[PDB]
Amino acid sequence: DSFVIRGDEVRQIAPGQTGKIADYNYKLPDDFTGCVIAWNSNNLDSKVG
Amino acid sequence: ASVYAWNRKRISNCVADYSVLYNSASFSTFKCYGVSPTKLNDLCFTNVYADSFVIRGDEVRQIAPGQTGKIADYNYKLPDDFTGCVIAWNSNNLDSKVG
Amino acid sequence: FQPTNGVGYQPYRVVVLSFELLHAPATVCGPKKSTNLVKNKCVNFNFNG
């Protein structure tokens, strides 16, 4: 599952946390068996303006 | 190169298209002193010196005429009569590794 | 997104890998090399996980 979020809401991508991404966008099960890989993409996903 | 060993390249005897620098949106800092930034194309210059280095984010404001700081005092000092532009962009992907 | 925005509001690309391991034959495995079959000896063994 690949997507793009902001930095403070990376901590919401984990089993058992709350927030706008966890509630309304992407929810992880509590019995999740797997990994979460997050990296900064300021050069590719940001534009001046 | 690092800021203490900043790299100067001599640009001369060519046609310089400054529009490709200006229209592209990745340069977070584009500050010209003594020259209007949108009027770069019509002017002719004798020679151009391009000085390239890497600094952290709070040290970008010291690359300006008349400013002070560690980079201005010990690493890279611009003259008070400086004519030209400072073009700084984020390079977090290319110059940072985890650890 | 802007490149001047702070790391709390900077883009992060997130890939969430979910591994499911059922009572099914495994199709996703590592590149560990298959050795020759040595039988009739007391060996540690690893047959498809």
Next chain:
Amino acid sequence: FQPTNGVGYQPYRVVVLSFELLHAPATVCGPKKSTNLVKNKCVNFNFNG
């Protein structure tokens, strides 16, 4: 530098272009294209800057 550091402590690549305008002939000129020479008439001219 670390990618998790805030934007004060993030890498920025800086190019300083310094133009010198002496009495020497100008060699670095922009992409403006030349026109034909018109003589004996009042014109508005740009002769090499």
